Amino acid sequence: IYDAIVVGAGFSGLVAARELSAQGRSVLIIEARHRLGGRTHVVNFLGRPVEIGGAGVHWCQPHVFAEMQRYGFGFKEAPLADLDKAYMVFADGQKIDVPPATFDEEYTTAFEKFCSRSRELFPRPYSPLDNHEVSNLDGVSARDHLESLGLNELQLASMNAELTLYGGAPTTELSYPSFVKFHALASWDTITFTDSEKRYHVQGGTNALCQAIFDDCRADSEFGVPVEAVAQTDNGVTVTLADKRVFRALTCVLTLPTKVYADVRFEPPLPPEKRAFIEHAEMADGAELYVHVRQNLGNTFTFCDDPNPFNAVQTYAYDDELGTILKITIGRQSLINLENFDAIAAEIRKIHGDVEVLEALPYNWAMDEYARTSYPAMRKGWFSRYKDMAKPENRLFFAGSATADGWHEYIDGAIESGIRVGREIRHFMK
Ligand SMILES: Cc1cc2nc3c(=O)[nH]c(=O)nc-3n(C[C@H](O)[C@H](O)[C@H](O)COP(=O)(O)OP(=O)(O)OC[C@H]3O[C@@H](n4cnc5c(N)ncnc54)[C@H](O)[C@@H]3O)c2cc1C
Ligand SMILES: [Ca+2]
Ligand SMILES: [Ca+2]
């Protein structure tokens, strides 16, 4: 009979368990997978460890920065000054070669226009509903706003590619204010936000940081079998796995990805406001992909606008013997069959021309049954309902990026939610 069962060993569940353990409470962690990290994941590609889920971080993200400080992780610098070529692929398929300086000027000036109201709308962005106007703007799509700004062709296409990636969806579906909030969190500053999304990653890898947090937990651990049901009463909670084993505790922290709750039986059932959020709020259809090209392409970056499938194509490595390793982020995996190698290769040739594609490693996060969304992009009309999902239901408590006040599409939000849920249980037990 545990003080707390924590369901899920991604960043939010690990931080929750670390906080409760540090409070002297007894903790059981239950994880479906045989690994830590959740939607962060390190795998081998061509014998090199690569991040294939989330990994970009910045010190303007205070919760992940605090953990990096605690465990001694630094910021690894992406090779931006070394960038040789930048390309924009428009929605109609036309590709243009843009000097990086021009690309940065047009992109950042478009971003500033898109986010110009961030200080008005989000004076206290870690309390993002403080200005009630954001609840009424929730139903405006990112595309509705984008088209109101008088942007030029490159500004429009690059911003729409960015917003397609963040939404994991056509930009007609993304909540406009939910994205502007990230600008506000970055000190209402376009350079800081656009830096945050490209300049740094976790030195040593997200898996090592998860391991360090896990190693600080004094908890029992059960990996490899998913939770199938959760039942609570006035005196406790009982959690049943799909192999029919049963565990019991006074409280339960759920960190499941929002759409996965539909695969778990809750007794009593979750309230209507949570079931509505579970059905409608999330949508991100993302996947990640690494490709090996025989040719040495140098250090290139490509943005492709919707409905091109490869919204961002970054260069992980290049040299005259290796060729090139490309890191590709796909906002809408529905647009390409990632089991079809030659279809992947054809899209690489559309961008990079006369090249030979040798190997591909996709990770389809949307089709992963324990993820189902790549990151908690908020559908228009739903960003302002996130407290319906974050609030406790008696002995059940809820964490995960989607429940965060701040950086809700990020590792930082997952960590925030772990600190917060540890606080809620601290007081529930007082
Ligand atoms: C391709 C990609 C790019 C991204 N880029 C960035 C980025 O640059 N920077 C950034 O900060 N964030 C980024 N993100 C987002 C970030 O990775 C996630 O927001 C964050 O990792 C979510 O943490 P979490 O703890 O909320 O959820 P998760 O990590 O999903 O953890 C939930 C856990 O619950 C487990 N689980 C699911 N079902 C069950 C069940 N029935 N029983 C038991 N356990 C279960 C899952 O296995 C998982 O371990 C990216 C994500 C992806 C996929
Ligand atoms: Ca160079
Ligand atoms: Ca500003």
Curated annotation (Swiss-Prot):
Q: Answer whether the UniProt record assigns the keyword Nucleotide-binding to this protein.
A: yes
According to its UniProt record, this protein's enzyme class is: oxidoreductase
* Cofactor detail note: Binds 1 FAD per subunit.
The highest taxon in the source lineage is Bacteria
Pfam families named in the record? Amino_oxidase (PF01593)
Q: Which residues bind FAD?
A: S12, E31, A32, R33, R39, G53, G54, A55, G56, V227, S401, E409, Y410, I411
* Molecular function GO labels: (S)-6-hydroxynicotine oxidase activity; nucleotide binding
Keyword field contains Nucleotide-binding: yes
Which BP terms in the Gene Ontology apply to this protein? alkaloid metabolic process; nicotine catabolic process
Q: How does activity depend on pH?
A: Optimum pH is 7.0. Stable between pH 6.0 and 9.8.
What does this protein need as cofactor?
FAD
Keyword annotations of the record: Alkaloid metabolism, FAD, Flavoprotein, Nucleotide-binding, Oxidoreductase, Plasmid
User: Matching PANTHER family, A to Z?
Assistant: AMINE OXIDASE, AMINE OXIDASE [FLAVIN-CONTAINING] B
Q: Which family does it belong to?
A: Belongs to the flavin monoamine oxidase family.
Role, per record: Involved in the degradation of L-nicotine. Catalyzes the oxidation of (S)-6-hydroxynicotine (6-hydroxy-L-nicotine) to 6-hydroxypseudooxynicotine. Oxidation of the pyrrolidine ring of (S)-6-hydroxynicotine leads to the formation of the optically inactive 6-hydroxy-N-methylmyosmine, which hydrolyzes spontaneously to 6-hydroxypseudooxynicotine. Acts with absolute stereospecificity on the L-form of 6-hydroxynicotine. Also involved in the degradation of nornicotine, and catalyzes the oxidation of 6-hydroxynornicotine to 6-hydroxymyosmine, which hydrolyzes to 6-hydroxypseudooxynornicotine.
Please identify the protein, giving its name as recorded.
(S)-6-hydroxynicotine oxidase
The species is Shinella sp. (strain HZN7)
Task: Report the gene name.
Answer: nctB
